[PDB]
Write an enzyme that holds these catalytic residues in place. Sequence first.
Site, mmCIF file in Angstrom:
data_model
loop_
_atom_site.group_PDB
_atom_site.id
_atom_site.type_symbol
_atom_site.label_atom_id
_atom_site.label_comp_id
_atom_site.label_asym_id
_atom_site.label_seq_id
_atom_site.Cartn_x
_atom_site.Cartn_y
_atom_site.Cartn_z
ATOM 1 N N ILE A 83 0.813 -1.216 0.000
ATOM 2 C CA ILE A 83 0.000 0.000 0.000
ATOM 3 C C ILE A 83 0.861 1.288 0.000
ATOM 4 C CG2 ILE A 83 -1.917 -1.194 1.118
ATOM 5 C CD1 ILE A 83 -1.064 -0.083 3.793
ATOM 6 N N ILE A 91 5.285 -1.300 2.589
ATOM 7 C CA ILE A 91 4.273 -1.452 3.625
ATOM 8 C C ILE A 91 3.226 -2.416 3.099
ATOM 9 C CG2 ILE A 91 2.737 -0.271 5.222
ATOM 10 C CD1 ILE A 91 5.677 0.740 5.317
ATOM 11 N N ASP A 198 10.964 10.274 15.167
ATOM 12 C CA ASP A 198 10.928 10.336 13.710
ATOM 13 C C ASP A 198 9.751 11.091 13.107
ATOM 14 O OD1 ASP A 198 12.159 9.969 11.226
ATOM 15 O OD2 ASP A 198 11.169 8.058 10.868
HETATM 16 N N1 LIG Z 1 -0.616 1.948 9.198
HETATM 17 C C1 LIG Z 1 -0.832 2.343 7.946
HETATM 18 O O1 LIG Z 1 -1.903 2.231 7.377
HETATM 19 C C2 LIG Z 1 0.267 2.943 7.158
HETATM 20 C C3 LIG Z 1 -0.004 3.490 5.817
HETATM 21 N N2 LIG Z 1 -1.220 3.503 5.214
HETATM 22 C C4 LIG Z 1 -1.451 3.975 3.986
HETATM 23 O O2 LIG Z 1 -0.558 4.301 3.202
HETATM 24 C C5 LIG Z 1 -2.913 4.059 3.601
HETATM 25 C C6 LIG Z 1 -3.068 3.412 2.227
HETATM 26 C C7 LIG Z 1 -3.150 4.930 2.363
HETATM 27 S S1 LIG Z 1 1.464 4.089 5.166
HETATM 28 C C8 LIG Z 1 2.384 3.664 6.572
HETATM 29 C C9 LIG Z 1 1.625 3.039 7.549
HETATM 30 C C10 LIG Z 1 2.261 2.605 8.848
HETATM 31 C C11 LIG Z 1 3.783 2.762 8.804
HETATM 32 C C12 LIG Z 1 4.285 3.985 8.033
HETATM 33 C C13 LIG Z 1 3.854 3.968 6.569
#
Ligand SMILES: NC(=O)c1c(NC(=O)C2CC2)sc2c1CCCC2
Length: 654
Positions: A83, A91, A198
């Site tokens: 994603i 991720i 961070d």
């Molecule tokens: N926990 C999430 O959904 C997540 C992301 N979620 C997403 O990118 C949603 C799909 C738009 S990016 C990300 C994380 C957690 C760690 C750091 C990078």
Amino acid sequence: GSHMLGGGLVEIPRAPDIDPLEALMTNPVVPESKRFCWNCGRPVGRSGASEGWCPYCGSPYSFLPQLNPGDIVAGQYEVKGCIAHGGLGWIYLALDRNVNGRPVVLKGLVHSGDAEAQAMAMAERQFLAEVVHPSIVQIFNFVEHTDRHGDPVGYIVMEYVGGQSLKQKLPVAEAIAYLLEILPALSYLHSIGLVYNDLKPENIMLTEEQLKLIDLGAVSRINSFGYLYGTPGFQAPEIVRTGPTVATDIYTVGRTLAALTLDLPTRNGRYVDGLPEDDPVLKTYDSYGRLLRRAIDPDPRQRFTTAEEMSAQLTGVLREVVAQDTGVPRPGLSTIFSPSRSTFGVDLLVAHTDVYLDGQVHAEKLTANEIVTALSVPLVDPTDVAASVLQATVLSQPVQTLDSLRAARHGDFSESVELPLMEVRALLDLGDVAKATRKLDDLAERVGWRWRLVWYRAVAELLTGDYDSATKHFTEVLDTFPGELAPKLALAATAELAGNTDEHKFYQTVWSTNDGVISAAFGLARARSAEGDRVGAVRTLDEVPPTSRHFTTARLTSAVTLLVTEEQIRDAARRVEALPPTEPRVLQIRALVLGGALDWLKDNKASTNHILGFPFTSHGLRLGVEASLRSLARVAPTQRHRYTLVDMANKVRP
Ligand SMILES: NC(=O)c1c(NC(=O)C2CC2)sc2c1CCCC2
Ligand SMILES: [Cl-]
């Protein structure tokens, strides 16, 4: 609905949130253009390989997903794909078998490591599943996956957050609003002895409901040793010397704000340190620039002491920003200073016209004493020993204050800083500057020049007429609390005493932000009058609230500053017209206005039929002036001045 950010100063439209299925990337690939070493930041794998080692630092890199659609991790997490991507890799979206296939997110813990480094990374981070806050992503598990090479690899399992990351530059009000929302998250972390480490646009996500911090991978203990996480360009320089601290998180907030708002230069992929030298954003928003510089100070001791302290200053700054770009004031109650105790310079301009009444010389100038008694004062620290006796003393005049404190002092307040500081305030209010400075200098020898001492020093230097030092010291306080209006007002008043043009337009900023600060309206007006803008001064004076006892004064002040077209003379008459003969100074300004309109008809023709009730003819104005003078003659406090007005009346008589 809309997000109501900044205590409703910033409205941001809600967007629904990305569904797991829509989040999945069809063909997850890092294009060559975007391949960089996570460790040293340099271009890596270029033509051109997807996996290898960095030739510069030796760090292993991979741009290839480590988990694939179809995979099942730890016999529990059913992998659907990628994603997103960042420094620690792809991720992954998985469906959780142990909770009805709820969507969860997996991310790697380390960049490389033997089975022990891998288990250690998990063991050391297990505590994170007890870090709970509404503005922070939930951690569900830590999980080991045996890869292709037969190697155990560690993953963290998180809540899916289908929001929009803050990662081409936001308006400053917007960015401040976002950061104001997560600062309580940082305060929370701090209260339990943790540092976020961070913070950056990438790690902050606007969802449909809220702002979230979405990555806890770098979280650690204050003063911790071992690997220190963060990203060069956002992280504090001293982090290796001091280890992580509140101070180091404060730095990342400043950096994050700058990154979101300014054209920050980059070398490598990294933002260079400090702020661009002549940035247009920093010019338009003065206090926002000062806020940024404090937060990112190379000395951790010179930054905001807590996230809560920074949040109060950032709120004040936001109020200043929003007020300036909307044209609507945003008043607030300071956490640092009192509200103004009074006004200064309100009747300078119209007192000049008092000559009409008494015949006295009226060359009133703004005085340090009037400013001093009107200025906000620093709020008393409630943990001081004397806080009870000082709160009891709150309604006491200066001398009564001195007496109560000295009596209280003579019978344990030996250690108290606030008791002596209150004595200084009182002595300054009475003009006893010499006594006050002795007292301050003694106190500074015991506790140093803490900011309250610097404040009262600046005030003393006002009474002393040493305006350069006053400016210097008020500025120090301003730069400590860039979101406060008290220091800006003090600097605008100093500039006036010194005969300088205020290149920072403090009066304007103060008045724009809080139309309860009447001193600033008149100050601002006097500055606009000084540079030929008699139109803006009247514009400014019109904004004085009708609830204020200074409204009539502001109205008469407008008439005076307007005296050149007919429409200006009409403007002047309109402001005087509404006021009864009951109100002090009305008669003399009537006289002055009709006077102006008479001198005007010498070189001009009227297309209006009256000024102040009198025919707009030479005959009518002379009759008006005459009548005004004879009326002033009847209230003239001396017979000598009575003769003066009568003579002038006979002379102007048509
Ligand atoms: N926990 C999430 O959904 C997540 C992301 N979620 C997403 O990118 C949603 C799909 C738009 S990016 C990300 C994380 C957690 C760690 C750091 C990078
Ligand atoms: Cl497994």
